Amino acid sequence: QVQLQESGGGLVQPGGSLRLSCAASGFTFSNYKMNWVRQAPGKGLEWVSDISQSGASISYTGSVKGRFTISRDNAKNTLYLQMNSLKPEDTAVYYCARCPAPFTRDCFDVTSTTYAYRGQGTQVTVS
Amino acid sequence: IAQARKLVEQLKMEANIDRIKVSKAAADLMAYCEAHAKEDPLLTPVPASENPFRE
Amino acid sequence: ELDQLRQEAEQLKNQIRDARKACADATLSQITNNIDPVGRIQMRTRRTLRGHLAKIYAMHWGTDSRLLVSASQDGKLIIWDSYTTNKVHAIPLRSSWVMTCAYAPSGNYVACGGLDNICSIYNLKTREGNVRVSRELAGHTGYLSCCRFLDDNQIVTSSGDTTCALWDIETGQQTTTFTGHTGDVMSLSLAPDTRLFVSGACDASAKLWDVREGMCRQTFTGHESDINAICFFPNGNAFATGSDDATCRLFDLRADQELMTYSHDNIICGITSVSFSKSGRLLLAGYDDFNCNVWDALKADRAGVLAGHDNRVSCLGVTDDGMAVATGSWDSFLKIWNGSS
Amino acid sequence: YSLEHXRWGKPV
């Protein structure tokens, strides 16, 4: 079964850091481009970072571009987000979201309000 | 909330299934194939005169 | 509280998974390894059906195994006499963006719909002799992905609304709504008894539904990605499922489990459409890479390939007589395949 | 009589 147990959140001070981790199970992880997605309180479901299935290509929103490192362990089927310089605007539930289909470069629906290949979500609260 | 409560109710409904062995399932599917092999034109191509698509 | 419900959901999921693993005594591959392999299946494009102006999404054989609807995003249904290649009807559509059609088991009606969420029911046996819309089944809130008639008065529908509905065409109303999915419902196969159906729905899950009870009886979840295609095995006790994950999977209803995966390393693209042969021994799967593979459903071997289309394959119907498989593509062509002996 | 390749291959 496709499941995405996102983890590693909690309370943190401004300027602190968290390593979000996402254990991927049941979907041959390294065929799929992987994303981190976000929902601030009362906001829409912002995308925040993307990593290709090889790890060789990466992107960020710019609002996080220097501050967030997306990382990927294909052998341990684990997605990482080293978010290293946090600020209150980063306070959100963080969702590990898989790209829909393997080998695709596009990921249409990773921000869709309901979307099946996305984790339960990790609360990150920045004081 | 209510989505997770109804998901729990659905998963209770699906937990109670009287599941059969996978070996018996496989035996049933192959028995059906063996019972329908001659009746299958794709598996056993019928004579060209019986095939309506080239007669 | 939500966390307690999530924990109960995880517990019941583990109970289901354990009951499956407990009844996984042996794989289908182990039981069928003694079976003599099917030979190289060669099918020979006995007909190419031409007249659609655009991509075809869908087809459905008549029970007569001779008439064939295909729906094209041209905005036409064509009724084909397969034995002659004759066009029996060309039906103008109110919306071009058709994505499903069904031919009724009586052949009295044809249905279609698509990006306009209406399911239009077209009356072929009309005393005025023109085909006309008999009912616009309106109440879906997202695109109509698959339709299948149970009877001339009853149609089950699947939508981009994460839903299925059974309609009474006399009234134009949902007599039952099926609402347990979470992704776009993409394909729908009626059971041979028409009492059950399975739908695959962009959540890598298949669900067994009871048409009368209105309830999901089983959820099958072996797929990694969007199930684009679903087909009951002719016994009605198993069904096959083509995914964006480039695999086909055969699920038994009763063992509640994936029996086999149909995948090969050379195949890296979604399965577009799935049909069994009349015996179930041949499992045909259409792919995004312009061709249709034939799988031994029991041995999971590629028995053959239907490499004759130029664009994405989109739909794949086997005659109820089993005499041919029809293949539709985005190239507007509609190819009918048998073989020879 | 002469059967020339093409026509007009030689003047007049």
Place this chain on the structure above:
Amino acid sequence: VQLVESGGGLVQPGGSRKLSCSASGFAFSSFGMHWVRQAPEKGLEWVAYISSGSGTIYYADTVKGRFTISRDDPKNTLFLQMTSLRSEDTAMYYCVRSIYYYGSSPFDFWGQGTTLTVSDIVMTQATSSVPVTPGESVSISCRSSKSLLHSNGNTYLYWFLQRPGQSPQLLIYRMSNLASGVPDRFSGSGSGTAFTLTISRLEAEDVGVYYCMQHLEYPLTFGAGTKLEL
């Protein structure tokens, strides 16, 4: 569906009339149309056919050089321009629609007819009349010179009922297919050369003349008809 025919009446030998058949309540352009005529105390005779879109026209040799069949699809109307008329042409002329596709029912609607008074396979219905009682099961035989069973497998006999003051109504097409409005009382079968129409529980609405017809090849030919008398 309505077909209503005009332009009949008295005309002299050698004269000319344009029969006009007007179509309403159906997709006239999509139907092939036939003229079938009936001499006053005689069986049906096919006259002319005009295909959908006029692409094919056929005539009986009794009219081939001398009648012309035409249609105005925009006006939903059909014409039979008759010329060099003869006593032989004294008949009720029925305007008959037909549509041709797999599973179609040709001849499924017949107009009320227009009467003109001028001042090849054989279909045999070996019994001209059967005296019958209500509730009886009656079989009307028909025979064809050639086997109407075509290699496409359609055994091809048509069956019509003309009630005493009505135009003919299709009961059964291509040997065995029951027409949409017609009671399951009626059932047809045959070898291809020999045929029967069974009528399993006669009602009074089943009295009339029953005509068998072939549609294997033109010219289309009708049997003499079998009258049923209650």
Place this chain on the structure above:
Amino acid sequence: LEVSISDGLFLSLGLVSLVENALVVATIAKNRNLHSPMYCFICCLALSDLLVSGSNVLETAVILLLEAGALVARAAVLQQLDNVIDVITCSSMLSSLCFLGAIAVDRYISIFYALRYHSIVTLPRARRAVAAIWVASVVFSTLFIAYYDHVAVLLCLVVFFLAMLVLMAVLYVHMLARACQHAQGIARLHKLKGAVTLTILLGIFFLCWGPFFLHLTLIVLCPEHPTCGCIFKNFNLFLALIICNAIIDPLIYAFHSQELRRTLKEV
């Protein structure tokens, strides 16, 4: 100088061009996706080149069998054979030139009236233009090869070649102008291939037809002259070069598209 192309090479070029055009024609006849107007004109071009190649093949074959002493026609019955085969060649030449013009006009309408293209160039109008081309080509070729001793024939046929060269140049140069405008737009947003293609089209066109129509012009310019005589010695080179365009135009236009390559592979 005299390139002195012998019958053997002439026949070999004619047969290889026969095969190439028969392949292009057969592929368009089989694959009904290629029943579009532009592929219709490509098929009609390849058929004109087939008839050129086959006519000149039959002509060298006839001359070889006569020179071998295997054929014993004479006077009128041989002149009528030479006349009809030369009508076949001249008609298939004029048709090939006209279908190169027609491909240029199709391409031109497809660029500059792109949105109205399927409203302007259609299978009815394509088939009508094709028929009008073959008809006019046979009419004018029968006129020219009957009146072949008349200056106005040679002059009209040269003026026709110059008209096709002017047409095809104007059309494809304007298409290259719009390609370069689009390449500048692309560069402006993003911040010679078409010149190469124009050079292949207009170059092979001029290099293969032009020496023949140059000969025909020089006849009108030189009923006797020593330097013109040298070019007259080369007429077999000029006909072999016409067959060479019959070879290369399948590559320029038909296998210029992947669908033709697939369709040739499928056979």
Place this chain on the structure above:
Amino acid sequence: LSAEDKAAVERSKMIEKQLQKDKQVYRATHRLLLLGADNSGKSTIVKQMRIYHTSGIFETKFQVDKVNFHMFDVGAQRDERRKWIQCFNDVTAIIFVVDSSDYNRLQEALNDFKSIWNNRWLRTISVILFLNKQDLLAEKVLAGKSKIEDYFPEFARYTTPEDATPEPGEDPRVTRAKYFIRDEFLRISTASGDGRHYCYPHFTCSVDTENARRIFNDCRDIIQRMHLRQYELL
């Protein structure tokens, strides 16, 4: 072939003749997909072209210079786009309307554009960018509480290109902002496609009547580019 079978072939040929008349209309019509978020004002682009020339798809059909355009605004669908979007392989273009003023949703619009662009079935479909609501962009830059560099750190490095042709009286900050937003979409547009499809940015407002002219010109230059590519001229 029997008389009925012959007549059924003749009906098939009558149908094929009607289907050819429909082929003529289908190829004379140019199909457009209108995409854009709820902020984008695509509804106002529709209203403009409608006036001046549970349903799941809204056809707008409009005509410019005797050329018929059918523009499909996706109607009442879920926000899971990836399946119905495959229907629009074989549109002439996708009109992608962006709210240039909504910087916090401009990255969302960029991810939508990048997904549309990189989709396997749209690999051949060119995109008409309506960078819309340019009045509100100008206001948000002049009344400059909202700083693009808060959302796009590249903007502090970005400098207006020599390409830029700002309208007279436009402040160079409004030019630098709008052309930055354009180039943020173009850096996606230029990263893949091998020339199979191209991107056509326009700066638009609701008051613009010329949006139909823009679409006409872009469709012209798309079909031109496609054919010049088929001819190995481009």
